[PDB]
Amino acid sequence: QNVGTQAAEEPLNLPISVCTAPGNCQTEADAVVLDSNWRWAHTTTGYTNCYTGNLWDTTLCPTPETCTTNCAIDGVPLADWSGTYGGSVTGNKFNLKFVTVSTNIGARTFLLDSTKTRYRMFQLLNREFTYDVDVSSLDCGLNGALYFVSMDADGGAAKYPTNKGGAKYGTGYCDAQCPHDVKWINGLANSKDWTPIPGDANSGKGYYGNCCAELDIWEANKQSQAFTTHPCTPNDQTRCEGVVCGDNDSGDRYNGMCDKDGCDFASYRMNDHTFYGPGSTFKLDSTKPFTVVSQFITTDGTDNGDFKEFRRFYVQNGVRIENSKVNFPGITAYDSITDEMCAATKGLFGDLDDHKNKGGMKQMGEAMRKGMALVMSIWDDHDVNMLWLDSNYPPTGNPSTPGVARGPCPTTSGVPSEVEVTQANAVVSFGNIKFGPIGSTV
DSSP: OEEESSSSSEEEEEEEEEEEEETEEEEEEEEEEEOOGGOOOTTTSSOOBBBTTTTTEEEEEHHHHHHHHEEEOOOHHHHHHHHHHHHEETTTTTEESSEOOOOOOOOOEEOOOSSSSSOOOOOOOOHHHEEEEOOTTTOOEEEEEEEEEETTTTTTTTTTTTTSGGGGGGGOBTTTTSOOOSSTTTEEETTOOEOTTTTTTTTTTOOEEEEEEEEEEEOSSOEEEEEEEEEOOOSSEEEEEEGOOOTTTHHHHHSSBBBOOOOEETTTTTOOOOOSSTTSSSSEESSSOOEEEEEEESSSTTTTTTTEEEEEEEEEEEEEEOOOOOOOTTSSOOOOHHHHHHHHHHHHHOOOOHHHHHHHHHHHHHHHOOOEEEEEEEOOOTTTTTTTHBBBBTTTTTTTTTTBBBBBBOOOOOHHHHHHOOOOEEEEEEEEEEEETTTOOO
């Protein structure tokens, strides 16, 4: 995309901590940038929309190349962050409102480095990543997500010279779902064969998808939470078409370059329904804030080893809370993501181990070694109504069959039109982000 001249781009300042030992950290003066999908797209030498509602203008965008020549994405000024997009920062806390009323629904954002010209790339192997979260106002059907993806640090600017904005304009998004709803891919409008998504007034799908590796630290609302590894072959940003995208709609979910299911550790799905929930007698009380700690263990305990284990623990009101465990007869009580856990649990659930097909923890680790961009988002799910996270999936499945039940939400929950009314004022908060060696962040 070209860059427009109507509004300066002003990312929100967000300090994080880089740590060397427990309680010995230094501030890193980073910032938050809005994903290019949420930006106004208009004519390069005017005010005329190139995209309105869920459609590209066919006169301006008869082809992707012409669209890209004629159109530009514009900046987010400071005033518009809260007023238009529902984003705000107080000290080291970042807040994202779900619906902001001209009416904005959801948000996806990235962490910029201290220069505000590149994404802050995190080399996560043999490191610990930690943050405080509040998901108390997110119920069934919503997801306040924090995760990493194998985006380029410059959003693709060096690879795709028609991308003028780079990381500064939140470009280059890709993930392990190979999404077609990304409006700008490889420096070009994804306007070919663009199709609105029914019941989604703001979104559509273009000819291409954009694939890359994804490490989900946090997919969650107050009812259920998960962390998940998604390797791809290769891991780096890859525009896809046809079978390579692994499109759900053509029966290709397991035929593409990315592991779409991922290998998940989701406490409720692993059959501990009392670990996490909205109340003081759950082990971890989702009505109150808490700290989420993630440790990325290698084979030799060094930065050069292969990724072998994703460990997790929590801190809430000064109380250390170890992760829940897998709880099925004849299955080891795993409390972390490893290749063995993935094989054993997917075996039990009858899920295809595409994680293993894509190179497993080792391949996931190669993405983490090269460095990944931090994503913070809030969203509802127009495909599957978040049932995969917090309900029975498939909805018609027996909840006593291992793998089906992922949370207590009813199978009628999560319809975007309903959650966008009922949960309009939901806000996820991510704060006090800390990064360092294992054992350094609490």
